[PDB]
Design a protein around this ligand. Structure first.
Ligand SMILES: CCCCCCCC/C=C\CCCCCCCC(=O)OC[C@H](O)CO
Ligand SMILES: CCCCCCCC/C=C\CCCCCCCC(=O)OC[C@H](O)CO
Ligand SMILES: CCCCCCCC/C=C\CCCCCCCC(=O)OC[C@H](O)CO
Ligand SMILES: CCCCCCCC/C=C/CCCCCCCC(=O)O
Ligand SMILES: CCCCCCCC/C=C/CCCCCCCC(=O)O
Ligand SMILES: CCCCCCCC/C=C/CCCCCCCC(=O)O
Ligand SMILES: CCCCCCCC/C=C\CCCCCCCC(=O)O
Ligand SMILES: CCCCCCCC/C=C\CCCCCCCC(=O)O
Ligand SMILES: CCCCCCCC/C=C\CCCCCCCC(=O)O
Ligand SMILES: CCCCCCCC/C=C\CCCCCCCC(=O)O
Ligand SMILES: CCCCCCCC/C=C\CCCCCCCC(=O)O
Ligand SMILES: CCCCCCCC/C=C\CCCCCCCC(=O)O
Ligand SMILES: CCCCCCCC/C=C\CCCCCCCC(=O)O
Ligand SMILES: CCCCCCCC/C=C\CCCCCCCC(=O)O
Ligand SMILES: CCCCCCCC/C=C\CCCCCCCC(=O)O
Ligand SMILES: CCCCCCCC/C=C\CCCCCCCC(=O)O
Ligand SMILES: CCCCCCCC/C=C\CCCCCCCC(=O)O
Ligand SMILES: CCCCCCCC/C=C\CCCCCCCC(=O)O
Ligand SMILES: CCCCCCCC/C=C\CCCCCCCC(=O)O
Ligand SMILES: CCCCCCCC/C=C\CCCCCCCC(=O)O
Ligand SMILES: CCCCCCCC/C=C\CCCCCCCC(=O)O
Ligand SMILES: CCCCCCCCCCCCCCCCCCCC
Ligand SMILES: CCCCCCCCCCCCCCCCCCCC
Ligand SMILES: CCCCCCCCCCCCCCCCCCCC
Ligand SMILES: CCCCCCCCCCCCCCCCCCCC
Ligand SMILES: CCCCCCCCCCCCCCCCCCCC
Ligand SMILES: CCCCCCCCCCCCCCCCCCCC
Ligand SMILES: CCCCCCCCCCCCCCCCCCCC
Ligand SMILES: CCCCCCCCCCCCCCCCCCCC
Ligand SMILES: CCCCCCCCCCCCCCCCCCCC
Ligand SMILES: CCCCCCCCCCCCCCCCCCCC
Ligand SMILES: [Cl-]
Ligand SMILES: [Cl-]
Ligand SMILES: [Cl-]
Lengths: 225, 225, 225
């Protein structure tokens, strides 16, 4: 079960990469080129992640617990680009963009530590720390980020509501899966955990990528001369 | 002794993070927001460092020598932000800012190698290399950095004299502690070495953070219309 | 044989660093200062690489195969700066510069995995992936990069032809050496592989560095008022 889902991730991320790459190649306009390029690299990174996992790499048995450490290495690179999708579209200021990237980096880094710690009590402490770094991004997203985006696009508040809703709902599912997996309560087996992360990753990357493009289209139409 | 000092670091860095975070939240002005945000992340990173150390993590016994490797990983992230405190306040040019960040990164990276090398002769070679990278930053700080800062703030030369004096004196103490610790002559025990690095870290982060804010206030008053 | 070539690399990169550092120190002009500084750090990084290798570091025996992993860590830092040499001189747009840096990072990262994988079939898969990331940069260099550079310097097309020819020919030799070495067919011994990478590195760093400076001189003369 796990193995097929890892190849599904390879396929889905590769297809995402191909179609964003084609979009980048054909873009009319530097802003469109940038947005397609961000999403290309989000999916190209994840394609590499899923190939490594599908090939059996990136995994260690830590004190008897099979542990996939590689996803944190690539998530550390792909999730800031997803943040940049948001801050590019929202024309977010530098300190708020930096704060989002920094809090996100903190979330991924402490999630890594929460995962690889042999002492699972210590790991769960880092899980809480990582959750608070995520909550920091939630606060920044629904306050400063949203208010700046609505100031920049007064007629497109719904666009950013949808972007934020999709980001926030999907990203909250990751710490839930983590608690269900063998990092937490071990309520689902590895094949199911792998399926869950794969579906989340494809949706949060390919899916959010296409939503970001559709959002860009709506923003540009709203701000046509 | 070591254990209590690691928790003291957790507490001190957490408090620094809280008060710079409050400052960032209430900032009047993008430049103030940026400066508070830099210092928030300096202290938030170090809070994570000290929690990991306090929990017993980040340490390996290398050929019989207890070695804390984690501080180099986080120092690699927090010290460039301290450099950015300086270059933000000094409005330093891009090549000099890049040179400072690059020489600092070189210092931390070779300090890491100096620390983790099992062959302590090789480690001491890297110690000398790291000292020369530090001396490179000294040269850049007291020459190009200072001259640009004084050109940008002709009436605030004392502000940058104090910033530089505090930076240079405090940062020079780190390679001294390193020579006293079990990385060098082992003239102080681990508890004393831990106390020394903890006090240095709190002063160089929380202390320098507050000095950077006070410096900003003086600069803005000097340049009020 | 290997040992002498590693010290030759130390010497050659140190000399490159010294002369670009002198150039940076004496630069007339921010653009010249930037260009000298990029090349200084390219060579300073590689000086550290070669010192570590010369001292016996950065190497592991993986399943009986001596493997130098450290060169990928420093190449990950020095090769983007070589890309920046090109994009600085060509005044390349942000999405194309980002795409070049991203594809290059992908090349080095998957080259690392191709190298350290114990399963050499898996390693060779990553070799192909890395080759395609290189081919991506080739496409970007000879198309978007070149066309932008020629638009920015209509009278200096030959300058960028020479820069690109030297970059492309030299960088293609690296995956050839990799196939000849014990990562691939093991057609040359370690001393010869080490010599090959050392000569390539000195040429691609010190040599390309001096070519970039000469190119800058030609560009500025072509665009003198
Ligand atoms: C701020 C957000 C805090 C998050 C979640 C609440 C509690 C969940 C965190 C603690 C996880 C505990 C856990 O995984 O328990 C292991 C389980 O008992 C198998 O032995
Ligand atoms: C440029 C700055 C050079 C720095 C310091 C001078 C010499 C200090 C560097 C050498 C350290 C030697 C050391 O740590 O000695 C180990 C000791 O003998 C336990 O066995
Ligand atoms: C796109 C570029 C593809 C690159 C090269 C063609 C084939 C080379 C890649 C495969 C290498 C095979 C190899 O190294 O073979 C090991 C050798 O048989 C010792 O046992
Ligand atoms: C791989 C991506 C990692 C992202 C890490 C982000 C870290 C964010 C840290 C924030 C502090 C910096 C705030 C803005 C600094 C601006 C500097 C300046 O204007 O000179
Ligand atoms: C985690 C922080 C690490 C910081 C590393 C800093 C490396 C500095 C390297 C200097 C070379 C670059 C000099 C300026 C390049 C400008 C590029 C451009 O203008 O296109
Ligand atoms: C050590 C060097 C590593 C270099 C990695 C480069 C990664 C490139 C990724 C490309 C995606 C970003 C494209 C441009 C983003 C611009 C963001 C913005 O304008 O707000
Ligand atoms: C077998 C598993 C397949 C998984 C597919 C899921 C996601 C990636 C596909 C994305 C395709 C987008 C095409 C859009 C278009 O060009 O119209
Ligand atoms: C994975 C890599 C994807 C590369 C995509 C290349 C895009 C080619 C565009 C062709 C065209 O539309 O004419
Ligand atoms: C622990 C740290 C992770 C949370 C980071 C919070 C970022 C926002 C704070 C701010 O306003 O500067
Ligand atoms: C319950 C779940 C709802 C929380 C997630 C959605 C947040 C919406 C954000 C917004 O509308 O800007
Ligand atoms: C709202 C949704 C909340 C989801 C919460 C996830 C909790 C994960 C652990 C489930 C508890 C029982 C575990 C077990 O004993 O097998
Ligand atoms: C017990 C150990 C305590 C260590 C405390 C040291 C440093 C961090 C405290 C910083 C508090 C600054 C408050 C400034 C203010 O708001 O007036
Ligand atoms: C550690 C994290 C610190 C977060 C600080 C949050 C700042 C809240 C400001 C509240 C206020 O002043 O109204
Ligand atoms: C070894 C290298 C560390 C020292 C780096 C020196 C930076 C300043 C040089 C310059 O002017 O470009
Ligand atoms: C003896 C120690 C003094 C050296 C450290 C202080 C340097 C001062 C720098 C300055 O005044 O700009
Ligand atoms: C000026 C201050 C100089 C500080 C120098 C630090 C040297 C550290 C080592 C001390 C030498 C004796 C060590 C020993 O034999 O125990
Ligand atoms: C013994 C091995 C020596 C290897 C030397 C090779 C390359 C680095 C030398 C670069 C010297 C450039 C000097 C240019 C000048 O200032 O005229
Ligand atoms: C390796 C480090 C190299 C540093 C080079 C320093 C340059 C000094 C310039 C001296 C001068 O030209 O007056
Ligand atoms: C696999 C990925 C490595 C190749 C990256 C290709 C970069 C150019 C694609 C684009 O136009 O955005
Ligand atoms: C055969 C080798 C030739 C390919 C490498 C040279 C490419 C030249 C690029 C250019 O002229 O812009
Ligand atoms: C054009 C140049 C092509 C260079 C190709 C390199 C191939 C490397 C492997 C050589 C094949 C024989 C190896 C052997 O059996 O020893
Ligand atoms: C745009 C920046 C790209 C950076 C490189 C991303 C490449 C990801 C490839 C997957 C990495 C897998 C690592 C597996 C290691 C196994 C070691 C044993
Ligand atoms: C970016 C890094 C942030 C800190 C994460 C440290 C992880 C250390 C992992 C060590 C593995 C042995
Ligand atoms: C466009 C595609 C967005 C993602 C849809 C969900 C993918 C699930 C894969 C099994
Ligand atoms: C703003 C950028 C933030 C990056 C993340 C910093 C988080 C630091 C947390 C401490 C890391 C401790 C690592 C311990 C590893 C132990 C492994 C066994
Ligand atoms: C940024 C990195 C600079 C080079 C440092 C290399 C450290 C390698 C550590 C290997 C540990 C096994
Ligand atoms: C503001 C505080 C600056 C640091 C003072 C020194 C802290 C020492 C802790 C024991
Ligand atoms: C401008 C950015 C500079 C980053 C630091 C580069 C320093 C390179 C020094 C060589 C690293 C060698 C690592 C050897 C590790 C051996 C561990 C056992
Ligand atoms: C930048 C990193 C891109 C991915 C490379 C992952 C390498 C993981 C190596 C693990 C060694 C045990
Ligand atoms: C598109 C990147 C290259 C494909 C992966 C490797 C194909 C060869 C597998 C054997
Ligand atoms: C200027 C020097 C450029 C490199 C020439 C080739 C160096 C070969 C070293 C053996
Ligand atoms: Cl990923
Ligand atoms: Cl730190
Ligand atoms: Cl290098």
């Amino acid at each position: 079960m796990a193995q097929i889902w890892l190849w599904i991730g390879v396929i889905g991320m590769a297809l995402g990469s191909i179609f964003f790459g084609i979009g980048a190649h054909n873009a009319k306009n530097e802003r469109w080129k940038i947005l397609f390029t961000i999403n290309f690299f989000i999916c190209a990174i994840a394609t590499g992640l899923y190939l490594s996992m599908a090939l059996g790499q990136g995994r260690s048995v830590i004190a008897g617990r099979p542990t996939v450490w590689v996803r944190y290495i690539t998530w550390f690179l792909s999730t800031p680009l997803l943040i940049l999708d948001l801050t590019f579209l929202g024309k977010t200021s530098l300190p708020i963009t930096a704060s989002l990237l920094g809090a996100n980096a903190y979330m991924i880094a402490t999630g890594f530590v929460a995962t690889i710690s042999a002492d699972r009590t210590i790991g769960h402490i880092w899980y809480v720390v990582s959750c608070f770094a995520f909550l920091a991004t939630v606060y920044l997203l629904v306050n400063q980020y949203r208010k700046q985006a609505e100031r920049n696009y007064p007629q497109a508040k719904k666009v950013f509501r949808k972007l934020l809703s999709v980001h926030l709902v999907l990203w909250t599912l990751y710490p839930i899966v983590w608690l269900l997996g063998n990092t937490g309560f071990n309520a689902v087996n590895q094949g199911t955990e792998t399926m869950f992360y794969t579906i989340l990753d494809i949706t949060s990357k390919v899916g959010f990528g296409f939503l970001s493009l559709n959002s860009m289209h709506t923003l540009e139409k709203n701000t046509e001369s």
